[PDB]
Design a protein around this ligand. Structure first.
Ligand SMILES: CCC(=O)NCC[C@@H]1CCc2ccc3c(c21)CCO3
Ligand SMILES: [Zn+2]
Length: 448
């Protein structure tokens, strides 16, 4: 057997020990991994093919292999006794000495020169804008009480999902570019991928929970106020985050959280299990996009039919807001002007509905800022649409569609997925006039 085929063999049996149940399954995997380690030792590397068999370049690899074999001897003594958790720890210790020592004259490192300066620039820009912008969102919602109670408590949850990915995984990815390879341990590798999982899936379900809250506030607005919202929304934020952790646990069993050299980041692997990836593309993308697309379609048909809209008085300038109503004149909050009985008159000048003109302009701050949150969703869809397509193609047939996907296309798609983390406060400033004022309020306070 060739050295290239043996490099895969002992690496494939190492993944078996991680998903093993008893010590006999570990002992059977350690026997195959030791025979492959002896075989790869009695083979010249393709990279150092020019280097002589006695010369000091190939002589260091021959002495380096015996260090890894002795580590299997220490691991098999634990496996004979019946220790699985102790032998799995010894297997991870041999895995670190198999990518640092053994991977010297081995590797298909044919990555184009543009992936390193782009990824890193995107990563610097994203991490810098995220830690500042999303922090200002947290600050503006915690300060402004009128904005917080306007269903923007979910924004704290979404901004924390965006922030957490900039503090732990993004900087480690940047170190993995400059040092060329994952410079941190396997425990730091699996965790970085998991943190990114919470940030991605958590953002999907936070956007959907917002689409439901903004669907119920415009459509079935009467029913909305009848149902409590005091303690309901902090409970929903807790539930959607626990659902995310539950959805991320099968990664620990399948073993899909490993280092990807293509994008220099320790992330989720699409080829590990085509059954679990299919569930991530459908249940955690295709389905939640479909329920949100319906939510905003029902809102847009109301705006198009000129339904829930502000009506201003052509006598004393009284602006009737459907979100406010007219409670002292019987109009309970959340009532459309087209539904108020014809006997109703202005509660300021007493002129009838006859002389009432609507605002033929929808502002992005109106109806709990429905337009901004819509833009937020469309932006999210754009960033994660190609990556979910790659994961969909591999799930169908990985035997022919996995090598068919270009390496350049994967980096281009993963660059967008990362960049989404800093884009959310940018759209709050440009579209939401109330957030814009609050951004200036905090920035002027930090100055003076
Ligand atoms: C289409 C499949 C895909 O590429 N999905 C996004 C990869 C994201 C981001 C990192 C991470 C970690 C764990 C995890 C997931 C991800 C999906 C479910 O478990
Ligand atoms: Zn009036």
């Amino acid at each position: 057997a060739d050295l290239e085929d043996n490099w895969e063999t002992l690496n494939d049996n190492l993944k078996v020990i991680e998903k093993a149940d008893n010590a006999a399954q570990v002992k059977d995997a350690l026997t195959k991994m030791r025979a492959a380690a002896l075989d790869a030792q009695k083979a010249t590397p393709p990279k150092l093919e020019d280097k002589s068999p006695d010369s000091p370049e190939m002589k260091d690899f021959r002495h380096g292999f015996d260090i890894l074999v002795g580590q299997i001897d220490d691991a098999l003594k634990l496996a004979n006794e019946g220790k699985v958790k102790e032998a799995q720890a010894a297997a991870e210790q041999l895995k670190t000495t198999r990518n640092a020592y053994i991977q010297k004259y081995l590797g298909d490192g044919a990555r184009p020169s543009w992936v390193a300066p782009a990824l890193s620039a995107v990563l610097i820009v994203t991490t810098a804008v995220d830690v500042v912008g999303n922090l200002l969102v947290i600050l503006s919602v915690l300060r402004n009480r009128k904005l917080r109670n306007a269903g923007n408590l979910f924004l704290v949850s979404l901004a924390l999902a965006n922030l957490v990915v900039a503090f732990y995984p993004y900087p480690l990815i940047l170190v993995a570019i400059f040092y060329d390879g994952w410079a941190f341990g396997e425990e730091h590798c699996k965790a970085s991928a998991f943190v990114m999982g919470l940030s991605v899936i958590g953002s999907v379900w936070n956007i959907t929970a917002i689409a439901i809250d903004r669907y119920l506030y415009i459509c079935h607005s009467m029913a909305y106020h009848r149902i409590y919202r005091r303690w309901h929304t902090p409970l929903h934020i807790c539930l959607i985050w626990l659902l995310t952790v539950v959805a991320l646990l099968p990664n620990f069993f399948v073993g899909s959280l490993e280092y990807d050299p293509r994008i220099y980041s320790c992330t989720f692997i699409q080829t590990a299990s085509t059954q679990y990836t299919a569930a991530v593309v459908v249940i955690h993308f295709l389905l939640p996009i479909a329920v949100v697309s319906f939510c905003y379609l029902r809102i847009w048909v109301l705006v198009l039919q000129a339904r829930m809209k502000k009506y201003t008085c052509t006598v004393c300038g009284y602006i009737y807001n459907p979100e406010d109503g007219d409670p002292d004149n019987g109009v309970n909050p959340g009532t459309d002007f087209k539904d108020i009985p014809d006997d109703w008159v202005c509660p300021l000048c007493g002129v009838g509905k006859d002389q009432f003109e609507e605002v033929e302009c929808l502002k992005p701050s109106d109806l709990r800022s429905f337009l901004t949150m819509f833009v937020v969703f469309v932006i999210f869809a754009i960033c994660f649409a190609p990556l979910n397509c790659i994961g969909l193609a591999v799930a169908i047939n990985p035997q022919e569609m996995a090598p068919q996907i270009p390496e350049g296309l994967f980096v281009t798609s993963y660059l967008l997925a990362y960049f989404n983390s800093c884009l959310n406060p940018i759209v709050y400033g440009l579209l939401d006039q109330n957030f814009r004022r609050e951004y200036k309020r905090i920035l002027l306070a930090l100055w003076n």
